[PDB]
């Protein structure tokens, strides 16, 4: 209904098919459309208990009501029955759909609206954003009626006189300066006693500052980690999981307390905080690319690190240079052959990888020590490079029980273990890591963040037609973004736990904030030591899924002594 000629047949359609009735070969007569016959047919047959009349039908073909069960619906509402965002059809976050993003266009599986594209087992539905629950039915009215399918529930928010109420007030000095009486964890395990028969044994060479007593069995922090509190627990040689509590915003980006000049003459002003035997090497021998840093040759992207230099523009995807991201891991699948996720090479014998792409029972996923393999030093994802890469079998996984896929990616931080030692090389070289007093001072000055990969993050979350995975390694720069800026962009609640980093977005475009890999290298070159310190883990973000948004990455300056307690276990488990 737009031009003169094509509107003429509107009256023809109305008479024969609607009021009276029609068939396929009758329709193909004065309609003149080989494909559009089937669209009508799908919409017509969907009106099951809606043959006649026009007043009672009205909007069954117009697609804004629900009859019988309701396979006619094409209408426009963001939300479902309760109050949860309907996911976009051809997007796949959180839960991946059983019907794919190609086979069936009949019900028109695109954009953030409800449908019924197979058979109504309950009602017409959309996929939830809430990663706990799977599906939920949308309460559309009935054609030629005022009646609703399912009741509405808004889900309130409370504090003053709603909860209980509790008003406990803050904890300073990351749980060193605190006393209490707790007995709970994330999943829920009873904490063991310190002075009894399973704790006192494993304590014969490590750092202490005993300002406090040893208090019975409670979640404590003597060794002085910047995170929280944990207790010992039972099982098949059991692990340690952190007891969860509420915390205040410690301005890690703007730390308060009472052009600039460059450093150069210094090889390494590093901390030897671990003991290379169980933990393995790569504390001293890291952050020193043999091809760039040792030979002392600037890459192209060292002359454009400052936010001050040429103000700012949208920087396009890059084809990387030869061997300029030796820190890289490419985690595959055994049967069938399938690239899954990414990891960051941290030592000669440790693998910091993503946790989301590991344990996720909405995808049916308990693939453990047998069904995995990692590959280091890969430029061509397509080809095989027998020498400059090589194969690396896996050993035990370790969990960080704060890890909550169920809620909102709280700590996407886990660890793997290789069996052999990966030998060092001209192509292969692990990356270093900084602590609180080193990391926080870097982002006082406006220094960019680097990410490399192949867009593994992009492909794993959205089906997304237009652009695809290249053979060549990606590489890209990202400036810094303020705290309340990123907070007032999105309405959904976030924390300092993670952080925001992207460019100034467009109106009519996706953007270039969805590159890299999932659990890949987020690094930054040092101006002091001519070194490379890793300060990020790539997980899910609003920069990919949504438009007009920045990529969302996890912080890593916490959990320093978490690894120190893990390396104790490797010695006793063997033999
Ligand atoms: C449904 O989802 C829409 C996604 O774009 C949003 O609509 C917006 O509506 C506002 C009106 O204040 C416009 O300013 C804006 O251009 C956009 O169209 C919005 O998240 C949501 N809208 C409603 C009404 O629920
Ligand atoms: C995976 O399977 C093992 C084998 O029985 C089971 O014991 C375990 O509970 C599963 N893994 C996890 C993390 O629950
Ligand atoms: Mg008529
Ligand atoms: Mg006829
Ligand atoms: Mg005919
Ligand atoms: Mg005919
Ligand atoms: Mg006819
Ligand atoms: Mg004809």
Numbering used by the authors: 1 to 258, 266 to 582
Report text from the authors:
The conversion of prothrombin (proT) to thrombin by the prothrombinase complex, composed of the enzyme factor Xa (fXa), the cofactor Va (fVa), Ca2+ and phospholipids, provides a biologically relevant example. Prothrombin, or clotting factor II, is a modular protein composed of 579 amino acids organized into the Gla domain (residues 1–46), kringle-1 (residues 65–143), kringle-2 (residues 170–248), and the protease domain (residues 285–579) connected by three intervening linkers. Activation of prothrombin by prothrombinase involves cleavage at two distinct sites, Arg271 and Arg320, along two alternative pathways that generate the zymogen precursor prethrombin-2 and the active enzyme meizothrombin, respectively. The hypothesis becomes relevant in the context of the recent observation that prothrombin exists in equilibrium between “open” and “closed” conformations that differ ~50 Å in overall length and with the closed form being predominant in solution (80%).
